[PDB]
Amino acid sequence: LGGSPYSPFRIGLEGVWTPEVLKARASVIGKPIGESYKRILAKLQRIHNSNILDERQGLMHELMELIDLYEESQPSSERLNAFRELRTQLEKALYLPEMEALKKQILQIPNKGSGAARFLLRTAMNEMAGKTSESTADLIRFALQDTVISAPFRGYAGAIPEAIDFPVKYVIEDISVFDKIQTNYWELPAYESWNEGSNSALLPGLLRESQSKGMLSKCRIIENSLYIGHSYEEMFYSISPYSNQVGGPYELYPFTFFSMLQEVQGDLGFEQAFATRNFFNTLVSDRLSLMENTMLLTESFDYTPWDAIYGDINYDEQFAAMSINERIEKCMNTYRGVAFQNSSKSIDFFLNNLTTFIDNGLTEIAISDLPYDIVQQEISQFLQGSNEWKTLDAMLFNLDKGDINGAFRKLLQSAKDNNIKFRAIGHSDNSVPPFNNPYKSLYYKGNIIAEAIEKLDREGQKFVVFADSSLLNSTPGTGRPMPGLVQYLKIPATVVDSDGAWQFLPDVASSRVPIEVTELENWQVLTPPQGKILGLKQFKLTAGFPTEQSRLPLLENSVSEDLREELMQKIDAIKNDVKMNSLVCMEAGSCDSVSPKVAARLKDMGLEAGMGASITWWRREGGMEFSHQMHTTASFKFAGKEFAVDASHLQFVHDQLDTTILILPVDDWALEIAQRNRAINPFVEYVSKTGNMLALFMPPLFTKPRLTRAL
Ligand SMILES: OC[C@H]1O[C@H](O[C@H]2O[C@H](CO)[C@@H](O)[C@H](O)[C@H]2O)[C@H](O)[C@@H](O)[C@@H]1O
Ligand SMILES: OC[C@H]1O[C@H](O[C@H]2O[C@H](CO)[C@@H](O)[C@H](O)[C@H]2O)[C@H](O)[C@@H](O)[C@@H]1O
């Protein structure tokens, strides 16, 4: 059942008005249907037509936003009673009564239709069902601090002219907004030959001159609107006094252009102010998906292997005890890599010893200070002797603080001259300071580490990486540490002294910690209690009744070929044990004391005791009630796995000639029992039960089947 009527998460629409019903409730005698109302009706129809539940809840959140916006724009509308009722219906259809704290956290995020709420509710439901790891609370914390996701949208929702030939990220709808700002960029000495009396008058010149030269190529004005194709972060790292001065290679013009964009922006977020709604939404959902990946990557990271090589208290002295050349040999030939801190001192040391790295097989240089998503192609251009790398060039000027000689430039130059691969592993999204928040820092670091894993720890590669210290070693993560590039890549991080000494950079204890948290308001744990919800559906037999024949593969696949014969011998022994057969029970309800007797005989047979297993589920009863039903088994332990020994399974429907004692690996046992019994929302705990602990063993209560129970 991929869409079960018994799932609490079925997103049922029984309590949500259809468009025809809305039409009568929201009708106003003299008022024709405006554009806002039409789009509300259209979206309501799409919701009711939606068969894919994830899309359905997505559309519902979008409708909530439409209503929010309408309420804000028309506070005296006589349609508001109907719209508010509809909004409450959608809230109740999505957020069940036991999800109050979740609902509050998620629906407090502005722009309910941005994708954030959809993603967060999807994650929450998967977490509650036991289909994803604990992540919702921390993904909410990320969303709440993120300068895009948490910002009430104030950008551009209009259409994009077909003349535009690049993907648009930002639009300034009315160019006159540039004349509203305090600074008169038109008075500045650099633009006196142009003869212009306003900021908006300078604008066409700045762009045209850019296009013909190199910079701001993805900016166009059409009919009083400015369309931008360069990302905020791309512009920030390629445009500054370092790269843009009077008489400089890129002159003042891009800086002037960007400076007034930022003045227009004011106290708003850049994307909040200027993004197209489309780019805004994409950014929201991409960031949440990437963060989730980063968080997942930190889960159960084992620091043991890394600490065994580099984590001894005296590793730094051992590193320092080697000559420089012995260190280079060890990094290249044994570790297959090394990282240096982001400093010009480190880069100069590397370049001064470059021959030695090359002689020991160096294949590649990687740096986090350039974004691959913007300049990887241009880097490839530089390396091949092309001149098409102006953005790269500007970015280098920024990195080198305008220094012509510049370490980053020199590093790149050396890769070309020496035919060594050069890789950017930075990722531009969310890369602009301030990094005054550990979630933004984690997001940014995670994307860089992900790229480095994909591109750097590969057979036949000997590499050096240059990165900011915050990327190198561990930093605070979500409920646990975020390991650094160096931990993930199995290499040491290093730094070069003011004395020019090359030394180890230890992973300090104070950084290898979780981010410090305050509980989210009234938060309830989402993850289920014990063992496992098998599925939020009714289970059924696929074929007919299981048989010993059908069960054989499950047994032989549970163990390696060399343990197979011994396993089958033990299974034969149990099935042919006189005392075990005496224990066989098949009258429903009278077998509750069987499992401890089975465990006792297994012990006397010399087998290893298992914890056992229990399964419980819901069953339809007369007058729309549901009862809990359960079963339990002892087990023996062999080759690391538990095997149910269930001498009372014949109390349940079965093949006519079935064996009296059911033996399967515990998971296969649970599945068989659930299917035979047409179990609804079955739940497994990996311990055998007797007496009260068995009789009242029931699935998590949120899984007891419910009506949609609205209007
Ligand atoms: O955009 C409309 C309002 O949306 C949010 O508030 C709603 O959702 C909260 C969480 O469920 C409720 O506490 C609140 O009563 C609802 O109005 C947002 O927090 C508000 O600032 C918006 O005005
Ligand atoms: O630019 C200020 C306005 O920003 C918001 O409106 C934009 O975003 C909405 C949702 O994408 C669109 O429906 C609307 O067309 C856009 O202009 C904000 O909602 C407005 O109150 C502001 O005036």
Curated annotation (Swiss-Prot):
Name recorded for this polypeptide: Dermonecrotic toxin
Lipid bilayer topology: Single-pass membrane protein
A GO molecular function held by the record: toxin activity
Keywords: Cytoplasm, Host membrane, Membrane, Secreted, Toxin, Transmembrane, Transmembrane helix, Virulence
Result after altering residue 279 to Y: In strain: CVI 47459
Signal peptide region: none
Claim: Repeat is one of the keywords in the record: no
A GO term from the CC aspect: cytoplasm
Additional remark text: Closely spaced cysteine and histidine residues may provide the toxin with an affinity for metal.
Organism superkingdom: Bacteria
Full-length numbering of the shown residues: 575 to 1285 of 1285
Subcellular location: Cytoplasm; Secreted; Host membrane
GO biological process: symbiont-mediated killing of host cell; symbiont-mediated perturbation of host cell cycle progression; symbiont-mediated perturbation of host G protein-coupled receptor signal transduction pathway
